[PDB]
Design an enzyme around this catalytic site. Sequence first.
Site, PDB file in Angstrom:
ATOM      1  N   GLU A 109      -5.189  -9.045 -12.687  1.00  0.00           N
ATOM      2  CA  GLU A 109      -5.191  -9.312 -13.937  1.00  0.00           C
ATOM      3  C   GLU A 109      -4.014 -10.336 -14.025  1.00  0.00           C
ATOM      4  O   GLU A 109      -3.000 -10.001 -13.427  1.00  0.00           O
ATOM      5  CB  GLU A 109      -5.068  -8.413 -14.704  1.00  0.00           C
ATOM      6  CG  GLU A 109      -6.236  -7.428 -14.880  1.00  0.00           C
ATOM      7  CD  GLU A 109      -6.136  -6.408 -15.881  1.00  0.00           C
ATOM      8  OE1 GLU A 109      -5.449  -6.737 -16.646  1.00  0.00           O
ATOM      9  OE2 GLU A 109      -6.960  -5.432 -15.627  1.00  0.00           O
TER      10      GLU A 109
ATOM     11  N   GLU B 246      -4.964   0.518 -13.620  1.00  0.00           N
ATOM     12  CA  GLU B 246      -3.834   0.836 -14.145  1.00  0.00           C
ATOM     13  C   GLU B 246      -3.587   2.189 -14.484  1.00  0.00           C
ATOM     14  O   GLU B 246      -2.896   2.566 -15.682  1.00  0.00           O
ATOM     15  CB  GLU B 246      -3.559   0.272 -15.603  1.00  0.00           C
ATOM     16  CG  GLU B 246      -3.507  -1.660 -15.211  1.00  0.00           C
ATOM     17  CD  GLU B 246      -3.344  -2.425 -16.419  1.00  0.00           C
ATOM     18  OE1 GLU B 246      -3.131  -1.821 -17.634  1.00  0.00           O
ATOM     19  OE2 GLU B 246      -2.923  -3.620 -16.206  1.00  0.00           O
TER      20      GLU B 246
HETATM   21  O1  LIG Z   1      -3.128  -6.300 -22.252  1.00  0.00           O
HETATM   22  C1  LIG Z   1      -4.021  -7.144 -21.225  1.00  0.00           C
HETATM   23  C2  LIG Z   1      -5.100  -6.472 -20.287  1.00  0.00           C
HETATM   24  O2  LIG Z   1      -4.208  -5.834 -19.288  1.00  0.00           O
HETATM   25  C3  LIG Z   1      -5.448  -5.271 -18.444  1.00  0.00           C
HETATM   26  O3  LIG Z   1      -4.531  -4.920 -17.624  1.00  0.00           O
HETATM   27  C4  LIG Z   1      -6.096  -4.197 -18.759  1.00  0.00           C
HETATM   28  O4  LIG Z   1      -6.120  -3.666 -17.662  1.00  0.00           O
HETATM   29  C5  LIG Z   1      -6.943  -4.834 -19.687  1.00  0.00           C
HETATM   30  O5  LIG Z   1      -7.836  -3.850 -19.788  1.00  0.00           O
HETATM   31  C6  LIG Z   1      -6.058  -5.382 -20.900  1.00  0.00           C
HETATM   32  O6  LIG Z   1      -6.821  -6.298 -21.845  1.00  0.00           O
HETATM   33  O1  LIG Z   2      -0.638  -4.992 -17.278  1.00  0.00           O
HETATM   34  C1  LIG Z   2      -0.709  -5.241 -18.954  1.00  0.00           C
HETATM   35  C2  LIG Z   2      -0.141  -4.043 -19.643  1.00  0.00           C
HETATM   36  O2  LIG Z   2       1.138  -3.866 -19.444  1.00  0.00           O
HETATM   37  C3  LIG Z   2       1.828  -2.565 -19.821  1.00  0.00           C
HETATM   38  O3  LIG Z   2       3.152  -2.835 -19.472  1.00  0.00           O
HETATM   39  C4  LIG Z   2       1.528  -2.759 -21.301  1.00  0.00           C
HETATM   40  O4  LIG Z   2       2.341  -1.693 -21.953  1.00  0.00           O
HETATM   41  C5  LIG Z   2       0.411  -3.129 -21.688  1.00  0.00           C
HETATM   42  O5  LIG Z   2       0.203  -3.012 -23.125  1.00  0.00           O
HETATM   43  C6  LIG Z   2      -0.405  -4.268 -20.991  1.00  0.00           C
HETATM   44  O6  LIG Z   2      -1.930  -4.245 -21.302  1.00  0.00           O
END
Ligand SMILES: OC[C@H]1O[C@@H](O)[C@H](O)[C@@H](O)[C@@H]1O
Ligand SMILES: OC[C@H]1O[C@@H](O)[C@H](O)[C@@H](O)[C@@H]1O
Length: 382
Positions: A275, A176
């Site tokens: 994910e 990410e």
């Molecule tokens: O917000 C849910 C999840 O999003 C995932 O992308 C993040 O990469 C995780 O590390 C996080 O717990």
């Molecule tokens: O991929 C998941 C992620 O998305 C983002 O847009 C949010 O800011 C994060 O809080 C979240 O974990």
Amino acid sequence: FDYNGEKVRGVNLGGWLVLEPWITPSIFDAAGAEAVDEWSLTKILGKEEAEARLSAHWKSFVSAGDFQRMADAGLNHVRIPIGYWALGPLEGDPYVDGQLEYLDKAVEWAGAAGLKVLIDLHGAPGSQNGFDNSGRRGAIQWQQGDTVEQTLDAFDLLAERYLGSDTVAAIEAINEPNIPGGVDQGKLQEYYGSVYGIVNKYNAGTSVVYGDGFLPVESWNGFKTEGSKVVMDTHHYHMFDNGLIAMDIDSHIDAVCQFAHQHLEASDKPVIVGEWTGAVTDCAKYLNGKGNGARYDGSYAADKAIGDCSSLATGFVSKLSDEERSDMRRFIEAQLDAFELKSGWVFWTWKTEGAPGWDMSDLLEAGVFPTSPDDREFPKQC
Ligand SMILES: OC[C@H]1O[C@@H](O)[C@H](O)[C@@H](O)[C@@H]1O
Ligand SMILES: OC[C@H]1O[C@@H](O)[C@H](O)[C@@H](O)[C@@H]1O
Ligand SMILES: [Cl-]
Ligand code: NA
């Protein structure tokens, strides 16, 4: 692994080697209100006590039996977050190391269970996203100073350590990288090129996984298009966007199908949904960061409450009704079938302290998570 022609069916070991407040709230809360990410947790505890508490967690959270349960559930992959600090904390970092011994065990245990491992460099120097799950929440300083070179230094050692194993089918450049939050795409592409070169120094058979940086995955068309060799990773969630979180079950399912048809099938590369989850709200305790509330119940960003978070914040899906479990399974089945239209999927996450809808180990025991492509309680969606 033939990412071009075979379906990834995976789970993440979130919260294991990179700790996250929502995944293991007890550990953060045992260090007080200011322990809001692994950086602050380790800083508060100091080096000796951080090593003690974090190593107790590394050892207890995952055993060979976890991997066997994953294989019994019809999985073929385990995605394993690791932070740069496992490969050497930088000067002044509070982080402790010792995770590599545990990732070594995971590779052994995965192999024994017949699984492939996707190693995921989940946190980079300076933070590539400002998320707690990068190690340190609250600014993006990756790409400043020497942080990218330091990221490549750690990536190189990670690749050098693991890519000799056929268990390790793929390695992800960085989790990410937050383009809309200010990560520069041109520089990101340079880092992606360098990562490709490192992978090929050690094992050209290993696939390179690139996150889409929150851009549409198909926007990456024409960058490193190489069949099974280069796999995009897109993350699909319905509780971080006002339009998605307002949806009923039918609308959620339609949006999953639309995502598969309009985005996954639009990519010129294999794409894993690396994910995704079973939850449809952001009620889980600390999900939006420790000390931040939830969109769903109106306690985040001045959003208008849709519902209450009383049931979905903590605990195990046995607490829910038959109808709530049924709807959860409907959403899961739709995702499995949608995401297998492209290259497959990797659920987030294997294990929590109780975050309804997020915990595969829970959902499997509850009969909510399917154990094969043929295990379907509802008609095929999409
Ligand atoms: O917000 C849910 C999840 O999003 C995932 O992308 C993040 O990469 C995780 O590390 C996080 O717990
Ligand atoms: O991929 C998941 C992620 O998305 C983002 O847009 C949010 O800011 C994060 O809080 C979240 O974990
Ligand atoms: Cl995206
Ligand atoms: Na909550």
